[PDB]
Amino acid sequence: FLNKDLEVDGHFVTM
Amino acid sequence: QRTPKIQVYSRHPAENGKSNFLNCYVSGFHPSDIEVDLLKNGERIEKVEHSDLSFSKDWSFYLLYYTEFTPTEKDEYACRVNHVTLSQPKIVKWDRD
Amino acid sequence: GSHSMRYFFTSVSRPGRGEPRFIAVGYVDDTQFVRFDSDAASQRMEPRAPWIEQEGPEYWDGETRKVKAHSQTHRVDLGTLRGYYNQSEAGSHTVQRMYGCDVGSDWRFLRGYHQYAYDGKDYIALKEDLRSWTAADMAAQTTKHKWEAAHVAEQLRAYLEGTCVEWLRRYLENGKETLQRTDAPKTHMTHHAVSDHEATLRCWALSFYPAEITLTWQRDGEDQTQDTELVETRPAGDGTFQKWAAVVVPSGQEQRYTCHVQHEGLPKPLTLRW
Ligand SMILES: [Cl-]
User: What family is reported (chain C)?
Assistant: First the structure.
């Protein structure tokens, strides 16, 4: 079961 | 860039006339784009399948390519691999032992 | 023993045309159970072991949504890292990610992982405390700062200690007939003359699972390490593994040599003699 993408305050956080 | 290591082998001990699977396991390579063919008496075998790309702890990739086959006394097999790290395709004969 | 869930993601840019090729595979221990390939027609997460087909249609829709989101994140990261490394648009590059969790013999969380490579080299990794990051180079310091400021380790830890373990336990139970079965290696020795005076003894370990195994030769009950040829463990293609080890010996002296096989499926190691 995959994780969700890194998200903070409604917005995704990438490298 | 890291060059592919190659093993060519059958799934089961080769017995002439008995159906089996010919495998070519490529591993330890980077980047992932690679061309692998299984050859019978020099000629590319069609419809060879492969596993889904995965990788080891050191990030190097591994793939298994395979096909059903029935070994006979006279037929020769090999695995042909091309990769950016190689000047021309590497070809390894299937040695039954 | 412990068990593991792992996902392995590979995204490769295609500078000549189009978006990156993305492949995701999921494993429990040494068993692949799902895949996604952006080049395939279905655009779905697909089953690769029978026990995952026990999950309902909502599972496949959810894992497809999540894996396609992961593909977009890797596409973004390829662009970002091209910039961090001041690379041109002409070359192909690779972002790999692995993440997952282990449970112990106690059925509780044991450890978690979440780490990345760029062009086949370590880039950033979550440390064992799941609370801090290891950056391999100065480029990755940028990401490490961004992720510390965003406090993203907390949500990763939540998944790794919680959701990940819960689903690993579910899979282990659903798949118990294979996932929680050990297959001890089927072992035998072959003998080949290489001359009238020397022969090769080859010790085979066949059809075993999981993949971890050790094969060693002894002569007169002491290790015979330097004179052993050992092939890397290789997949049979049916979900089990194979390995062999060989030694060349003077013919007539075969009885001095023993092969020793250690594997989790063997309550005591096996000793084989010609
Ligand atoms: Cl391209």
Answer: Belongs to the MHC class I family.
